Amino acid sequence: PISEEMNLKILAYLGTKQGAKAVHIAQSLGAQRSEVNRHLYRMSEDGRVRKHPQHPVWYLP
Amino acid sequence: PISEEMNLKILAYLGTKQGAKAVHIAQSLGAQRSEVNRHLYRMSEDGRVRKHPQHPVWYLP
DNA sequence: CGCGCG
DNA sequence: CGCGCG
């Protein structure tokens, strides 16, 4: 499922970086890569985060 | 697979009608709804299209 | 190697 | 009912 609280933890982390990989987001939150990726991709649908067009690297809009 | 040619056709439809549903894009292009959605969701990852936060309706940023 | 998939 | 899933 989707945790809005997980969404907010990810957004807060991205707010401290200039682009980040899910593996490092997961490391820094103490979460699993799959959970972080599930949330990143869903947030990207409506524009809350954005992925590099070629690389698995994530940014705030 | 993902066709960049298909991406451009979908973007062109959206440029004509904001707030479109996949079924209507598919009808116009002569494609399957599932194919159109596969491309919409992948384009949403890097912000080329954007989904409505609550509905399967699509916008062009 | 991109993987998120329920 | 959101479904895109390979």
Report the interhelical angle of B33-45 vs B22-29 (nearest 10°). Answer: 120
Question: What tokens does B2 get?
Answer: 């993902």
Contact, A36 vs A10, CB < 8 A? yes
Which domains does chain A possess? 1-61 (1.10.10.10)
**Measured distance CA(B28)–CA(A45) in Å, rounded:** 23
Q: Which residues of B touch A52 (CB under 8 A)?
A: 46
* B33: nt with nearest C1' to CA: D4
Cβ–Cβ under 8 Å, residues A30 and A36: no
Q: How was this structure determined?
A: X-ray
Resolution in A: 1.5
Q: Which residues of A35-53 are buried (b: 16+ CB within 10 A; e: fewer)?
A: bbbbbbbebbbebbbbbee
Q: Which helix or strand (DSSP H or E) is residue A36 part of?
A: helix A33-45
